């Protein structure tokens, strides 16, 4: 009964059938995670890195996190570290997790970044200064309905849906909440005048994103192996539309703005990503989901492996025939499709 729910939540028997791509390279300079990433229309890619998550491996617990930038229009894109400026943020404790971008009517680019300084959660709002390759911190957002934020999707400069992957803030309590299988994780709509729960009762809600026309919201429920599709309404509420099931732990969801396809980074075996073992490291798996509203969504494994190259894939996105894949605490891979 408990064996058994544990073995299925954590997919503890799963081994990964490989699925290769013609030409993949490790992104040089990423060795401490690349948990989330987001690619602008112009090919600039933001990557958050250095996440320290309780119970989870990290190779440099003393180094603070960073937001990296890659220009994917380059033949061999090199990463650089974005300089964060401003006096409203303590960088010494920057511990970045999910991110999302919003482009205003004036073409100002805002970056929203989930941050875990100590045990806590905030969402930091930055303005991207392209010529300078820097991030100007604008605002720290925190809220009782954002106790344990995993990812967000922005729908304005300080308006977003956020997944909380746990109900509790304290990591000792979170650990009990997860192992007891309470499924109290929930999703919050945040805006300046109006903050509310929009969906609830998830077993580790994680990735979240939105269709390019703004009518559907997708939420990954990691330990249930589901992605939930909701209709999103003009008053910002969500209503359940459908649920897809997978044989893998789904992490972050990227949405291709031309087709609306989902690109999902996934953990084939949960035991390996939650209990790190250098000799038995977590693998990587990327799904593409097409026609997600149709009667049978088309799901393809685009890339899959056991960890000998890339460990703990959480996120994948595409840009002009290339695929960039990030991980919780390891490296990043850039691939021809
Ligand atoms: C809402 O649902 C909430 O979470 C789960 C199921 O989703 C319920 O029940 C839970 O509690 C016990 C704790 O001893 C667990 O061993 C059990 O596996 C679990 O399902 C809770 O009583 C309810 O609080
Ligand atoms: O976004 C996250 C954050 C932590 C984490 C831990 C184990 C597996 C997947 C995870 N995803
Ligand atoms: Br450019
Ligand atoms: Ca995100
Ligand atoms: Ca639910
Ligand atoms: Ca995530
Ligand atoms: Cl708490
Ligand atoms: Cl569709």
User: Ligand 6 center to residue 294 CA distance, Å?
Assistant: 26
Would you say the CB of residue 274 lies under 6 angstroms from ligand 2?
A: yes
The pair of three-digit structure tokens given for residue 207, joined into one six-digit string? 């990735």
**Where do runs of H (alpha helix) occur along the chain?**
2-9, 171-179, 270-274
Resolution of the model in angstroms: 2.2
> Which mutation among 5, 175, 180 tests ligand 1's pocket best, with the greatest number of atoms within 8 A of CB?
180
Backbone angles phi, psi at 275, to 5 degrees: -125, 85
The pair of three-digit structure tokens given for residue 74, joined into one six-digit string? 């380059």
Q: Which domain holds residue 311?
A: 1-337
- Give burial (CB, 10 Å; 0-12/13-18/19+) of 83: middle
User: Ligand 8 center to residue 298 CA distance, Å?
Assistant: 10
CATH code of residue 238: 2.120.10.30
Residues noted as catalytic: 97
Nearest to 214 by CA among 158, 251, 257: 257
Query: What is the largest distance, in Å, between two alpha-carbon atoms of the chain?
Result: 57
For β-strands 83-85 and 134-141, DSSP reports them as parallel
The pair of three-digit structure tokens given for residue 36, joined into one six-digit string? 């989330």
Q: Write down the experimental method used for this entry.
A: X-ray
Residue located via tokens 């969801």: 253
Q: DSSP secondary-structure letter at 16?
A: P
User: Ligand 4 center to residue 189 CA distance, Å?
Assistant: 15
Task: For 9-27, give one letter per residue: b (16+ CB within 10 A) or e.
Answer: bbbeebebeeeebeebeeb
- Give burial (CB, 10 Å; 0-12/13-18/19+) of 42: exposed
Beta partners for 164?
149, 186
Backbone angles phi, psi at 296, to 5 degrees: -125, 95
CA 272, chain centre distance (Å): 18
CB atoms within 10 A of CB 149: 27
Would you say the CB of residue 197 lies under 6 angstroms from ligand 1?
A: no
Number of domains composing the chain: 1
Would you say the CB of residue 18 lies under 6 angstroms from ligand 1?
A: no
Q: Please identify every residue whose CB atom is under 5 Å from ligand 4, which is an ion.
A: 36, 98, 100, 151
């Amino acid at each position: 009964r408990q064996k058994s729910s544990f073995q299925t939540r954590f997919n503890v028997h799963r081994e990964v059938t490989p699925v290769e791509l013609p030409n993949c390279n490790l992104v040089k300079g990423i060795d401490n995670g690349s948990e989330d990433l987001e690619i602008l229309p112009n090919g600039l890619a933001f990557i958050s890195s250095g996440l320290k998550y309780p119970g989870i491996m990290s190779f440099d617990p003393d180094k603070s996190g960073k937001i990296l930038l890659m220009d994917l229009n380059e033949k061999e894109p090199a990463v650089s570290e974005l300089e964060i400026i401003g006096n409203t943020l303590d960088i010494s404790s920057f511990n970045p997790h999910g991110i999302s971008t919003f482009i205003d009517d004036d073409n100002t680019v805002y970056l929203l970044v989930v941050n875990h300084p100590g045990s806590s959660s905030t969402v930091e709002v930055f303005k991207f200064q392209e010529e300078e390759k820097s991030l100007l911190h604008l605002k720290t957002i925190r809220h009782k309905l954002l106790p344990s934020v995993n990812d967000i999707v922005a729908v304005g400069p300080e308006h977003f849906y956020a997944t909380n992957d746990h109900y509790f803030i304290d990591p000792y309590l979170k650990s009990w909440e997860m192992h007891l299988g309470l499924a109290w994780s929930f999703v919050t709509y945040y805006s300046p005048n109006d903050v509310r729960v929009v969906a609830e009762g998830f077993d580790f809600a994680n990735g979240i994103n939105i269709s390019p026309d703004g009518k559907y919201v997708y939420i990954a429920e990691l330990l249930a192996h589901k992605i939930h599709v909701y209709e999103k309404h003009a008053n910002w509420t969500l209503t359940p539309l459908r649920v897809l099931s997978f044989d893998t732990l789904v992490d972050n969801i990227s949405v291709d703005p031309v087709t609306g396809d989902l690109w999902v980074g996934c953990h084939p075996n949960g035991m390996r990503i939650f209990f790190y073992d250098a000799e038995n490291p977590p693998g990587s798996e990327v799904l593409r989901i097409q026609d997600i509203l149709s009667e049978e969504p088309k799901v393809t494994v685009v890339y899959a492996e056991n960890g000998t190259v890339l460990q703990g894939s959480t996120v994948a996105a595409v840009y002009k025939g290339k695929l960039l894949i990030g991980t919780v605490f390891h490296k990043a891979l850039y691939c021809d499709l």
